[PDB]
Amino acid sequence: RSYQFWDTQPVPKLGEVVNTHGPVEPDKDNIRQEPYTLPQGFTWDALDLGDRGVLKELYTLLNENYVEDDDNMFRFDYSPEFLLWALRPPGWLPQWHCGVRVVSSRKLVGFISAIPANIHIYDTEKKMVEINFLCVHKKLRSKRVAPVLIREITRRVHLEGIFQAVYTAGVVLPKPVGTCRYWHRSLNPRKLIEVKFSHLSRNMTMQRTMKLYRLPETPKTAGLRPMETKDIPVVHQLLTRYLKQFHLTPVMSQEEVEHWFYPQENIIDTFVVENANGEVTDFLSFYTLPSTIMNHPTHKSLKAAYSFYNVHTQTPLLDLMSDALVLAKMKGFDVFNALDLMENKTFLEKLKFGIGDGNLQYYLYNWKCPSMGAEKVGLVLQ
Numbered sequence: 001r002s003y004q005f006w007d008t009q010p011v012p013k014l015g016e017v018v019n020t021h022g023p024v025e026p027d028k029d030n031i032r033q034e035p036y037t038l039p040q041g042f043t044w045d046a047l048d049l050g051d052r053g054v055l056k057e058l059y060t061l062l063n064e065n066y067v068e069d070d071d072n073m074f075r076f077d078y079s080p081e082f083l084l085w086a087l088r089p090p091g092w093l094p095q096w097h098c099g100v101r102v103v104s105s106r107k108l109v110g111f112i113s114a115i116p117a118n119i120h121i122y123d124t125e126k127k128m129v130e131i132n133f134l135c136v137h138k139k140l141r142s143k144r145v146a147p148v149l150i151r152e153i154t155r156r157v158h159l160e161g162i163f164q165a166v167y168t169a170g171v172v173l174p175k176p177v178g179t180c181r182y183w184h185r186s187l188n189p190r191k192l193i194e195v196k197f198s199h200l201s202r203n204m205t206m207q208r209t210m211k212l213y214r215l216p217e218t219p220k221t222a223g224l225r226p227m228e229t230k231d232i233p234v235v236h237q238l239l240t241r242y243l244k245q246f247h248l249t250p251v252m253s254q255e256e257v258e259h260w261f262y263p264q265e266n267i268i269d270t271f272v273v274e275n276a277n278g279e280v281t282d283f284l285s286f287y288t289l290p291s292t293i294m295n296h297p298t299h300k301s302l303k304a305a306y307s308f309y310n311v312h313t314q315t316p317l318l319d320l321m322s323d324a325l326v327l328a329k330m331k332g333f334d335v336f337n338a339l340d341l342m343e344n345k346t347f348l349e350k351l352k353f354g355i356g357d358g359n360l361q362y363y364l365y366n367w368k369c370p371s372m373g374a375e376k377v378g379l380v381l382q
């Protein structure tokens with residue numbers, strides 16, 4: 001298999017055996033000042049997401065044209081407020097919210113984003129960007145517009161002095177640094193079956209299925225409570241120390257910890273364990289991301305919670321995640337999703353997750369290093 005675009009890029013070849021560590025190519029000391037050329041009739045536009053009208057335009061583009069499941073039954077439905085959380089963390093830049101519009105109608109038809117992040121990869125720490133929300137309108141697919149988006153965001157990142165990036169995708173490209181499977185924990189099995197997200201087992205009745213997945217009405221862990229402002233420093237401390245055991249991780253500042261974890265309703269939830277001495281010893285977090293259910297007369301939307309970062313030092317991880325499930329059910333979610341990264345394999349089967357169909361691939365741009373098992377991956381992108 002050959003890759004017309006990716007073979008030109010500074011990433012290793014599929015099937016390459018990698019035993020070194022470092023950049024694929026040297027930093028560039030002169031950078032192209034002009035935007036790359038788009039097909040006739042289209043134009044670049046940097047989106048001011050602080051403008052409510054423009055934010056709505058981006059919401060609509062993704063709602064109608066972003067990621068679907070392998071069976072074209074479900075599509076991500078990121079909320080406007082969620083998009084602000086994901087796209088304006090500390091250090092964000094407006095030129096890195098890179099849109100494509102139709103010149104005559106002004107209709108938004110393409111997008112790609114970068115946000116800054118410090119990344120720890122094996123024995124090196126590097127200022128990088130995270131690339132996300134690449135999207136091309138359904139009517140423009142298969143016209144080689146995506147390589148233009150990728151080159152242009154690459155150019156604009158270069159201008160700010162950054163020459164490495166990290167990203168994830170479902171498709172196989174040159175060349176994965178890690179491969180994760182996603183798993184799903186049923187919370188509202190009757191609905192999941194009716195919309196064909198999952199199927200009734202041939203050796204189980206619906207009645208048995210509902211009882212199999214029933215949860216406690218309240219969490220077990222003593223001292224569990226929502227994260228507060230006073231917890232920001234200790235949460236930062238807990239996260240930084242916990243992440244050292246993995247090989248691909250973010251390195252967050254205290255301000256970045258506040259952004260990514262301080263609770264925002266219908267976006268991000270974080271709960272800490274404050275013990276008998278008043279000490280915070282653990283925390284769990286998950287983000288809110290529904291999926292549109294397409295072509296269905298009665299059910300319109302699937303409510304899903306996604307496991308984020310979970311740190312344990314005194315409470316068992318199994319107990320922590322059990323409480324996470326209970327909280328999601330209480331808050332009205334239909335399903336709780338988790339990847340098989342970090343230590344997650346220790347609890348997925350015990351807590352009745354079922355394996356999904358598909359991979360999430362992890363990638364680095366312009367950095368050569370050996371691949372790693374999923375258990376060594378310690379980074380999560382929205």
Ligand SMILES: CCCCCCCCCCCCCC(=O)SCCNC(=O)CCNC(=O)[C@H](O)C(C)(C)COP(=O)(O)OP(=O)(O)OC[C@H]1O[C@@H](n2cnc3c(N)ncnc32)[C@H](O)[C@@H]1OP(=O)(O)O
Nearest residue numbers: 003004005006132133134135136141142143144145146163
């Ligand atoms: C130093 C700074 C560096 C910064 C940049 C770092 C790299 C960033 C990389 C981006 C990370 C994004 C992370 C996320 O956001 S992952 C989410 C991706 N988005 C979606 O799945 C939304 C639904 N799909 C679409 O909107 C379109 O199908 C997209 C836009 C995905 C492709 O549009 P289209 O289907 O009309 O195709 P084309 O004819 O224009 O172009 C075909 C070429 O594009 C390659 N392709 C297809 N999908 C992806 C993909 N997800 N990553 C990388 N490459 C991809 C493909 O192999 C082929 O190249 P080659 O096979 O000929 O070689």
Ligand SMILES: Cc1nn(C)c(C)c1CCOc1c(-c2ccc3c(c2)c(CN(C)C)nn3C)ccc(F)c1F
Nearest residue numbers: 067068069074075076169170182291337338339381382
């Ligand atoms: C539910 C649902 N609705 N839709 C429309 C889909 C695909 C799903 C499966 C979601 O799968 C995941 C993903 C996960 C899997 C694949 C992904 C993604 C997330 C993302 C979003 N970020 C990570 C780029 N892009 N891609 C291709 C990440 C973590 C999980 F726990 C999952 F279960």
Ligand SMILES: [Mg+2]
Nearest residue numbers: 142143144145
């Ligand atoms: Mg295209």
